[PDB]
Amino acid sequence: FNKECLLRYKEAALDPNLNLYQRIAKIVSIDDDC
Amino acid sequence: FNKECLLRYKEAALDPNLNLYQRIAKIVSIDDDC
Amino acid sequence: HEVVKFMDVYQRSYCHPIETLVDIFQEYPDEIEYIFKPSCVPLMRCGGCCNDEGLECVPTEESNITMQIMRIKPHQGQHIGEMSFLQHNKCECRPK
Amino acid sequence: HEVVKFMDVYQRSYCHPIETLVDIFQEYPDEIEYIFKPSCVPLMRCGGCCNDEGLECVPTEESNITMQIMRIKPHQGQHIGEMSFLQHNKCECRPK
């Protein structure tokens, strides 16, 4: 855990197919769990 | 007096030949005396 | 040469509607169980000086603008909703 | 239709250098026996949100700008002089 959280955030930045809304939204999800 | 001060301010606005600097500057003078 | 001339400076700083960044919670203070994204919004609001201590810059004409803000309810999900804000269309310098 | 879309709003409100109107006496606090005209100036300064309470918007690159301000000495005359101010060229969101 935590290690997992960083990875989750990192992937969010890393993904080229999320547009701004998709990206902002996924961050919010990572926040809920983390 | 005072009556004079209003007139002085009024003329400042009224004059079409003062440009912004000339106009702002004259106001400062009216302030010194008034 | 590369200095802003008085007349240019004086005009640009004088009281007028300027794009100001306003915080949403500060405008919607009743919405306590909501985080917003973006947490602030760009609004046209009065700003600038009147160049006199007897005068203050105030709005004379206001209109509305609506924006799609993300409304986040911590640990309970999120949705995009419309929210409406006041914008200042015209500013005057008037006595304090 | 006439509502600002999330992606548009979110980008425009996000931390960046924005034309801010800064008071001169607040930047030159030592100059006590001087009124200035204009009393404030338009400067590029950081503004906007980071959309997280762990982050704050800060300047990473600053430069100077010089403007001709009227320097008024009450009841003793006036002259236009150059005065120099700090401008923010670049802003980052970084941890508080």
Side-chain angles (χ1 to χ4, degrees), chain D residues 64-78:
Chain D
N64 300 340
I65 190 174
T66 298
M67 308 181 169
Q68 288 180 338
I69 305 312
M70 188 177 278
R71 319 187 64 182
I72 305 166
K73 224 177 170 189
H75 316 297
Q76 306 180 248
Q78 146 272 124

Side-chain angles (χ1 to χ4, degrees), chain D residues 46-65:
Chain D
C46 289
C49 44
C50 293
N51 302 311
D52 197 285
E53 275 295 310
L55 296 171
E56 58 172 25
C57 185
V58 309
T60 56
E61 197 212 292
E62 306 76 45
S63 64
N64 300 340
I65 190 174

Side-chain angles (χ1 to χ4, degrees), chain C residues 6 13 20 33 39 59 63 65 71 73-74 76 86-87 92:
Chain C
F6 173 79
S13 54
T20 304
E33 34 55 80
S39 67
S63 64
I65 190 174
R71 319 187 64 182
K73 224 177 170 189
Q76 306 180 248
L86 210 78
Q87 281 206 119
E92 262 196 62

Side-chain angles (χ1 to χ4, degrees), chain D residues 5-56:
Chain D
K5 307 312 186 237
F6 173 79
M7 300 196 297
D8 193 7
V9 185
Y10 184 91
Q11 181 281 314
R12 292 168 61 209
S13 54
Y14 191 86
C15 170
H16 70 291
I18 192 179
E19 179 176 298
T20 304
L21 296 172
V22 181
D23 188 282
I24 301 178
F25 185 72
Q26 190 172 305
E27 294 285 322
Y28 275 78
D30 300 304
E31 313 224 64
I32 66 166
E33 34 55 80
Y34 270 111
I35 289 181
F36 305 107
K37 231 161 269 269
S39 67
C40 73
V41 297
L43 297 173
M44 294 294 284
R45 294 292 185 82
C46 289
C49 44
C50 293
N51 302 311
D52 197 285
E53 275 295 310
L55 296 171
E56 58 172 25

